[PDB]
């Protein structure tokens, strides 16, 4: 039902998850996530996996984050026995229902029944100063949808919100 063309034009965060966890028929499970700033080598965030059912994440960042040029994302995941072809993530970010950027990453070849490592390069959009001020000023109103497709079918959907106020 849901293909990449259904999400590629969205101008708002979705009101609900567009797929159920049962539709993840390929048993894809993300187990590690690490963010590196390509201009300082600084690790900006790193986690390792031990209602929303774990499909929502809250992120606490700093104001400097909104001026980064390029960020390297290291992602580790396991895969079931079904071979996976045309694995694709489409991740859209919004502040106050205004599209900031949409990232389209095609995964490399996925080895079934095994752990895989992939690297995504995030080229940040140049954000206007007024938009920078408002995202710092109103935490958690920057939101994202991450859509995962295998052979042009929605199989995973995650959500997140973001703070750029530090802690």
Ligand X SMILES: C/C=C(\C)CC/C=C(\C)CCC=C(C)C
Q: Does 159 bind ligand X (CB under 6 A)?
A: no
Q: Which of residues 65-84 bind ligand X (CB under 6 A)?
A: 66, 71
The span from the CA of 116 to the CA of 98, in Å, is 34
Closest C-alpha to 158, from 143, 147, 142: 147
**Torsion angles phi and psi, residue 38, rounded to 5:** -75, -5
Size of the site for ligand X (CB under 6 A): 12
Q: Does 124 bind ligand X (CB under 6 A)?
A: yes
**Residue window 10-49: x/- pattern of binding to ligand X, with contact defined by CB under 6 A:** ----------------------------------------
| 164 labelled ligand-binding | no
Instruction: End-to-end CA distance of the chain: give it in Å, rounded.
Output: 41
Residues forming a β-bridge with 122 = 71
Which distant-in-sequence residues (6+ apart) come within 8 Å of 35 by Cβ?
Answer: 43, 44, 45, 46, 71, 72, 73
Beta strands 154-163; 56-60: pairing state: parallel
Q: Which of residues 125-144 bind ligand X (CB under 6 A)?
A: 125, 144
Stretch that binds ligand X, among 6-14, 20-28, 93-101, 147-155 (CB under 6 A): 93-101
Output the known binding site for tetradecanoate. 59
Output the known binding site. 59
Q: Which residues bind ligand X (CB under 6 A)?
A: 57, 66, 71, 93, 100-101, 122, 124-125, 144, 146, 160
């Amino acid at each position: 039902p849901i293909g990449p063309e259904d999400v590629l034009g969205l101008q708002r965060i979705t009101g609900d998850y567009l797929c159920s966890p049962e539709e993840n028929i390929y048993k894809i499970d993300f187990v590690r996530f690490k963010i590196r700033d390509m201009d300082s080598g600084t690790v900006l965030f790193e986690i390792k996996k031990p209602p929303n059912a774990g499909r929502f994440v809250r992120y606490q960042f700093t104001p400097a984050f909104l001026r980064l040029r390029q960020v390297g994302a290291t992602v580790e995941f396991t895969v079931g026995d079904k071979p996976v072809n045309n694995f694709r993530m489409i991740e859209r970010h919004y502040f106050r229902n205004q599209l900031l950027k949409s990232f389209d990453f095609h995964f490399g070849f996925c080895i079934p029944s095994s752990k895989n490592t992939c690297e995504h390069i995030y080229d940040f959009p140049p954000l206007s100063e007024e938009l920078i001020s408002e995202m710092i000023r109103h935490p958690y109103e920057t939101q994202s949808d991450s859509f995962y497709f295998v052979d042009d079918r929605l199989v995973m959907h995650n959500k997140a919100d973001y703070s750029y106020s530090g802690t």
